[PDB]
XYZ file of C-alpha atoms in Angstrom:
133
model
C -0.247 -0.120 0.288
C 3.153 2.356 1.499
C 6.267 2.629 1.159
C 6.623 5.646 2.280
C 5.172 7.821 4.882
C 5.766 12.181 4.270
C 7.414 13.334 7.878
C 9.276 16.790 8.370
C 12.020 14.904 8.432
C 12.166 15.160 4.007
C 9.987 19.441 4.618
C 11.674 22.434 2.516
C 10.518 25.042 1.284
C 6.341 24.935 0.392
C 6.671 24.729 -2.929
C 9.104 21.723 -3.140
C 7.037 20.154 -0.463
C 4.744 19.815 -3.909
C 7.260 18.371 -5.595
C 8.905 15.860 -3.116
C 5.386 15.068 -2.291
C 4.776 14.274 -5.754
C 7.669 12.425 -6.327
C 6.793 10.205 -2.558
C 3.394 9.550 -4.414
C 4.570 7.721 -7.831
C 6.835 5.561 -5.087
C 4.020 4.325 -3.633
C 1.790 3.712 -6.546
C 5.098 1.610 -8.549
C 4.964 0.137 -4.823
C 1.330 -0.716 -5.303
C 1.659 -2.051 -8.837
C 4.911 -4.119 -7.602
C 2.608 -5.421 -4.986
C -0.116 -6.310 -7.652
C 2.163 -7.836 -10.135
C 1.199 -6.179 -12.860
C 4.135 -5.089 -14.903
C 2.963 -2.810 -17.478
C 1.802 -0.465 -14.838
C 5.163 -0.824 -13.194
C 6.245 0.219 -16.362
C 3.909 3.286 -17.194
C 5.301 4.616 -13.792
C 8.034 4.318 -13.283
C 8.243 6.224 -16.640
C 6.360 9.101 -15.081
C 8.608 9.032 -11.984
C 11.821 9.233 -13.693
C 9.530 11.656 -16.519
C 8.879 14.167 -13.915
C 12.406 13.327 -10.538
C 13.753 15.597 -14.238
C 11.393 17.770 -14.274
C 11.636 18.401 -10.364
C 15.451 18.951 -10.672
C 15.326 21.318 -12.983
C 13.287 23.137 -10.906
C 15.526 23.485 -8.163
C 18.423 23.790 -10.642
C 16.149 26.839 -12.344
C 16.112 28.114 -8.698
C 19.935 27.214 -7.901
C 20.418 29.651 -11.305
C 17.899 33.061 -10.546
C 19.191 33.226 -6.654
C 22.916 32.883 -8.052
C 22.889 29.628 -5.275
C 26.776 28.439 -5.067
C 26.625 25.148 -4.949
C 24.315 25.004 -8.291
C 27.247 23.193 -10.062
C 27.920 20.193 -7.604
C 23.997 19.503 -7.220
C 23.130 20.030 -10.835
C 25.403 17.262 -11.363
C 24.134 14.710 -8.509
C 21.214 15.353 -10.167
C 22.243 14.089 -14.009
C 24.282 10.955 -12.138
C 20.944 9.973 -10.809
C 19.301 10.888 -13.973
C 21.560 8.539 -15.965
C 21.852 5.809 -13.205
C 17.246 5.546 -12.700
C 17.671 4.953 -17.106
C 20.419 2.413 -16.362
C 17.534 1.287 -13.282
C 14.783 1.285 -16.287
C 16.201 -1.408 -18.615
C 15.713 -4.130 -15.919
C 12.193 -4.050 -15.961
C 11.807 -5.241 -19.614
C 11.935 -8.061 -18.425
C 12.030 -7.949 -14.737
C 9.341 -9.538 -12.859
C 7.982 -7.887 -9.964
C 10.945 -8.671 -7.477
C 12.929 -5.994 -10.040
C 10.625 -3.863 -9.602
C 10.909 -3.585 -5.604
C 14.741 -4.269 -5.502
C 14.440 -1.046 -7.664
C 11.456 0.766 -5.870
C 14.457 0.068 -2.471
C 17.060 2.058 -4.378
C 15.006 4.831 -5.687
C 13.665 5.347 -1.886
C 18.015 5.155 -0.426
C 18.605 7.912 -2.743
C 15.278 9.614 -2.459
C 15.654 9.536 0.941
C 19.082 11.316 1.173
C 19.320 13.268 -0.920
C 15.862 15.491 0.289
C 17.983 15.416 3.933
C 21.376 15.792 2.913
C 21.787 17.754 -0.603
C 17.893 19.603 -0.665
C 18.216 20.776 2.725
C 21.729 22.570 1.439
C 19.484 25.044 0.252
C 17.071 25.357 2.184
C 17.762 28.415 4.463
C 19.884 30.308 1.757
C 16.469 30.406 -0.488
C 13.976 31.175 2.528
C 16.598 34.103 2.974
C 15.743 35.706 -0.239
C 11.827 35.378 0.342
C 11.530 31.881 -1.711
C 9.060 29.604 -1.108
């Protein structure tokens, strides 16, 4: 049903929260499709999740640009490498089964939770004090 429950530990700017929450929602969708052993849906939700992650990444990066965030370069590269990783994981789904989907999911969760708490948290105060919401 639910793999990841939203908590204050994942909180950031309000606008950013809407995107992180949506990513958590995709994770849970993908979990339910795996639980249902529905591989077509699993592949479809994984595609949507990946596409949405890329747009969320792009949104952060635009905030880094507009606001001249000093660590814009490293954070962007972190995003880029993870897109690469997601694209690699995706290839396994064509021939994979629900257990493959689960293993992928744990990977996605582990990265996302860490990234939000460790990397995304670094930009929060900087953007807050410049009036970003």
